[PDB]
Ligand binder design. Structure first.
Ligand SMILES: C[S@@+](CC[C@H](N)C(=O)[O-])C[C@H]1O[C@@H](n2cnc3c(N)ncnc32)[C@H](O)[C@@H]1O
Ligand SMILES: O=c1nc(N2CC[C@@H](F)C2)c2ccc(Cl)cc2n1-c1ccccc1
Ligand SMILES: O=c1nc(N2CC[C@@H](F)C2)c2ccc(Cl)cc2n1-c1ccccc1
Ligand SMILES: [Cl-]
Ligand SMILES: [Mg+2]
Lengths: 388, 371
């Protein structure tokens, strides 16, 4: 009878992550390197920096109003060097690539409608839109195990690449983790890892069997708790075989094309806005961080085992248009009661979020790989003590 | 008691991200017209005076990219420097790397995850929030093109907050709580005239009167000035409206963009198939609302995982729904392409007003289920 109980009582869920050298993630990191360069000189910089990456090319396009003097050639090339593209053998070289800049001022129509001649507390949302925050008690970091493990596998590849223990590794990687879960009254309980995919760019020397052995022994077994790995776990390691061609040569990349990788790995919800290259007046970023803070506060405060928060704005309007709560049936309180607790404890005006989460600080390049949520030393990851 | 709000947004055809989606799918369709087996990964970037095409194409087609891009921008309505953008005079840069070149067993072209969603709250099996948001942008384009509101320009955004009730997981729309409309405009029209027209000629022509009341909140031209717009106002990129393209924040999203990708990209083909599955389950009476996840590995034909969430709206378990899906659908990428007839140049039609909930797409025709 056990097989029948397993089929009925369990389900699969899949999340992916990508490494720093994935071309879409290159763009996110460069966009946030540009944002941080501005904020280091001008904490009030208005930044909307999109990056495009293709064979031999980084293009910056968008809108910046800032008192900073930023050397875009230096910032871009230093970011590409850090990622590890330093030779034509790797498909891309920070020393010799083309960097094109098409950056203008912020629209004066936007500036006058959002922030000009306002106290910072009264600044309007920098756009309309919807944003979600999510938290789950299934991990200590209050994140889905699927996305946590997917990100940590890419971080482990970069670590062993950079310390030279796996020197055949190159910067471009993708990971994907399928977890088999059971539920406890709307809370999800991870049982085992069902399937792992790892695809990583490599040099010309190493054989397919040697790479597959190292990815299991030095990466997967160093990241995934042994209790989640068993004789039935499926490993797709270099599944499409050779991956010498990678980075921007392999595929065009853009800023904001990994927004599900950046958030909850498909769990929770997403309002569609990209984070990278945007200052705190862009609610796509600041209100998603605040909603994460709310969701994590509700779970660590013991009000929910899992929770989703929606918030929405209109351009030029400080107060949110709507706030909504979905507790997945994991609270003794109604969604109406939880929403009252939120409105009693939190103030999701962008001019207040920036103070509560210290969002003028140049920490954004750190967020642009391995996820914006579930990591140490970000203000939105410190739960607020709730009163009600 | 038991009520809640949910918000979705949409953007118009001249929103700079949507310009990019439409151009990327115009390029895809141009290739498929000549070479039905064309491989296309066409990313478009739009900023002041510039359309850039970047990506990878394997095609026998000979495509005039200048003509395809300029005709797409003309149709959207950017035909003069007074509007911030002109198809006649803009820079078109082409960075596309083109190469000369059993179907059921072909491997996925990439790893990834994809979701499909359906809800019985509308006939089109889509959330009311995203349906109304899209229809408000379509009405703007309509009244711009027929000259009844000649001060309108192509760049628009809408946002609709609906107040809902629930019936055992099924969602029941009560009323429109809040509407935002921001639309690019000429320098002659006054703010009072635009706000009056947006309420009377746009909103009241689109939203059923039963959903509007004296408490409905209107944010019309809330920035107060929107003369600068299109790519001049804000850089556009392909695949930066993926939630507008799908369910308006309802259901779920795997992160893959649709526009500029041929039918061999599972980011597109498996999302369309997952929609087809979810819609078939709802129209088949098995659920009131349902979410389907599928995932792939590069070089593997069979999905790595398939998952169902019925929101508590089925008398059947998620396990029984999953068995019905597996008995009725083959979500191998080569089989999806055959079953949904995806080699046809139909993609530019998808690139504004959403990929789902609309007439005459094969993924919107429910499959009759045998179980
Ligand atoms: C507000 S802009 C995003 C922020 C912008 N990149 C910046 O530099 O602050 C995003 C979208 O809003 C719309 N938009 C542009 N200018 C606007 C204005 N003056 N008022 C309202 N909406 C506007 C356009 O559809 C544009 O693509
Ligand atoms: O939150 C979630 N919980 C699932 N659970 C299964 C029953 C209980 F165990 C919970 C679930 C399972 C399958 C899928 Cl395809 C989505 C799910 N989602 C979900 C829902 C909306 C959006 C994103 C993910
Ligand atoms: O499907 C959904 N249903 C809601 N309902 C409220 C109780 C019942 F009426 C249903 C709901 C409400 C608020 C929010 Cl913030 C999300 C919700 N979601 C949802 C969940 C996951 C992802 C995307 C949206
Ligand atoms: Cl936007
Ligand atoms: Mg933009």
């Amino acid at each position: 009878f056990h097989e029948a109980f397993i089929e009925e009582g369990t389900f699969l869920f899949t999340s992916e992550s990508v490494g720093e050298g994935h071309p879409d993630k290159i763009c996110d990191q460069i966009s946030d390197a540009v944002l941080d360069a501005h904020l280091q000189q001008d904490p009030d910089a208005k930044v909307a920096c999109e990056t495009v990456a293709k064979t031999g090319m980084i293009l910056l396009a968008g809108e910046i109003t800032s008192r900073a003097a930023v050397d875009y050639q230096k910032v871009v090339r230093e970011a590409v060097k850090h990622i590890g593209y330093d030779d034509s053998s790797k498909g891309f070289d920070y020393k010799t690539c083309n960097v094109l800049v098409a950056l203008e001022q912020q629209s004066p129509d936007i500036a006058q409608g959002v922030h000009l001649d306002r106290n910072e507390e009264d600044i309007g949302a920098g756009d309309q839109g919807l944003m979600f925050g999510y938290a789950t008690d299934e991990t200590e970091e209050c994140m889905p195990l699927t996305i946590v493990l997917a990100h940590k596998l890419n971080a482990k590849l970069a670590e062993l690449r950079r310390n030279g223990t796996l020197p055949w590794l190159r910067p471009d990687s993708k990971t994907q983790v399928t977890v088999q879960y059971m539920q406890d009254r709307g809370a999800v309980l991870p049982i085992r890892v069902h399937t792992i995919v790892i695809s990583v760019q490599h040099d010309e020397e190493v054989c397919l069997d040697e790479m597959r052995d190292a990815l299991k022994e030095k990466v997967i077994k160093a990241v995934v708790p042994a209790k989640y790995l068993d004789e039935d776990t499926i490993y797709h390691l270099q599944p499409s075989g050779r991956f010498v061609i990678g980075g921007p040569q392999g595929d065009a990349g853009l800023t904001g094309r990994k927004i599900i990788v950046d958030t909850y790995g498909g769990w929770g919800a997403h309002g569609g806005g990209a984070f990278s290259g945007k200052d705190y007046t862009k609610v796509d970023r600041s209100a998603a961080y605040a909603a994460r803070w709310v969701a994590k506060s509700l779970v660590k405060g013991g009000l929910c085992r899992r929770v989703l928060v929606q918030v929405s704005y209109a351009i030029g309007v400080s107060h949110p248009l709507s706030i909504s709560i979905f507790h997945y049936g994991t609270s003794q309180k109604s969604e109406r009661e939880l929403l009252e607790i939120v409105k009693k404890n939190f103030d999701l005006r962008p001019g207040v979020i920036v103070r509560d989460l210290d969002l003028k600080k140049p920490i954004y390049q750190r967020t642009a790989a391995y996820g914006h949520f579930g990591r140490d030393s970000f203000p939105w990851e410190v739960p607020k003590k709730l009163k009600y």
